[PDB]
Amino acid sequence: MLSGLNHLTLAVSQLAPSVAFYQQLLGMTLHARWDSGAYLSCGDLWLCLSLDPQRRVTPPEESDYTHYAFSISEADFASFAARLEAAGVAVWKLNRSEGASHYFLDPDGHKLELHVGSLAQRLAACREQPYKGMVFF
Amino acid sequence: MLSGLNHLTLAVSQLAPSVAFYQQLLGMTLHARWDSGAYLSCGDLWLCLSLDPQRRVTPPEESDYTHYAFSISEADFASFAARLEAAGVAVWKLNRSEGASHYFLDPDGHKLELHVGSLAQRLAACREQPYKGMVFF
Ligand SMILES: Cn1c(=O)oc2cc(N)ccc21
Numbered sequence: 433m434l435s436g437l438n439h440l441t442l443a444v445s446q447l448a449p450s451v452a453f454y455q456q457l458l459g460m461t462l463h464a465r466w467d468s469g470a471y472l473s474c475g476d477l478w479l480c481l482s483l484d485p486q487r488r489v490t491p492p493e494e495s496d497y498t499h500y501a502f503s504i505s506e507a508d509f510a511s512f513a514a515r516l517e518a519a520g521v522a523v524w525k526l527n528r529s530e531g532a533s534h535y536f537l538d539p540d541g542h543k544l545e546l547h548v549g550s551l552a553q554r555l556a557a558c559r560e561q562p563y564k565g566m567v568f569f
Numbered sequence: 570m571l572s573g574l575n576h577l578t579l580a581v582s583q584l585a586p587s588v589a590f591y592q593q594l595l596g597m598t599l600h601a602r603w604d605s606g607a608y609l610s611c612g613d614l615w616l617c618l619s620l621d622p623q624r625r626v627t628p629p630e631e632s633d634y635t636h637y638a639f640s641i642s643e644a645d646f647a648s649f650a651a652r653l654e655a656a657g658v659a660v661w662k663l664n665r666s667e668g669a670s671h672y673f674l675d676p677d678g679h680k681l682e683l684h685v686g687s688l689a690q691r692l693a694a695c696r697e698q699p700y701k702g703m704v705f706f
């Protein structure tokens with residue numbers, strides 16, 4: 433049986449700007465780097481950056497909704513979002529639901545999110561106000 | 570500051586086959602399903618499937634190396650990989666080895682992986698057989 437997420441690998445077009453973004457701007461820990469990649473950690477998340485000549489810098493309009501959300505406390509949310517805004521990081525969506533979320537792009541157009549709250553909190557909200565066609569198990 | 574992965578959202582072209590893949594074949598826990606999405610969990614991982622008409626099924630040769638790996642134990646690895654092959658699940662190829670892994674595709678061409686081992690184990694293996702240009706911090 434599967435026990436969780438082992439690692440997330442993002443293809444990047446240029447290693448140096450991506451390391452700067454994830455390590456310096458976002459504060460992740462850099463464990464190792466090589467000619468074509470890097471290993472970072474963010475809490476219990478193992479993140480791999482893989483240099484890939486196939487990766488296009490992709491505008492948000494030309495990619496689908498696939499995205500990766502990082503955990504942050506409500507107390508830290510506003511100052512972290514302000515840091516991204518000062519660095520000029522682009523936003524790809526406004527938060528229109530309950531729950532604190534900030535939607536931002538990485539240098540290659542990967543869709544990222546800061547989110548406060550757990551699955552259990554989302555499910556409780558949804559039991560009060562279910563989406564169209566919602567069934568629980 | 571960031572503390573890990575909050576959730577992973579995959580855009581899917583058809584909801585029913587994707588739910589079946591992650592729940593029936595991969596054994597993830599289905600918590601809720603509605604007309605345009607589903608919430609699943611895999612250990613600590615919160616997985617969201619989001620129906621997206623923009624999602625195209627892409628051959629692995631024309632998508633980049635971005636991929637998602639799930640943890641499995643040494644005792645279950647081979648028999649789980651055997652069940653996927655028997656079910657006709659397609660495969661893809663990465664440019665580099667990263668230990669005991671099996672690489673497979675979901676119905677929309679998202680690149681998935683089963684992997685045995687932690688970041689710490691990977692770093693120890695790399696010290697004996699480093700990638701080209703590798704440096705450790
Ligand atoms: C088969 N099925 C299920 O188990 O939960 C559903 C929810 C919706 N909206 C539509 C179909 C199903």
Ligand SMILES: [Mn+2]
Nearest residue numbers: 499501545578
């Ligand atoms: Mn999200």
Ligand SMILES: [Mn+2]
Nearest residue numbers: 441638667682
């Ligand atoms: Mn991998």
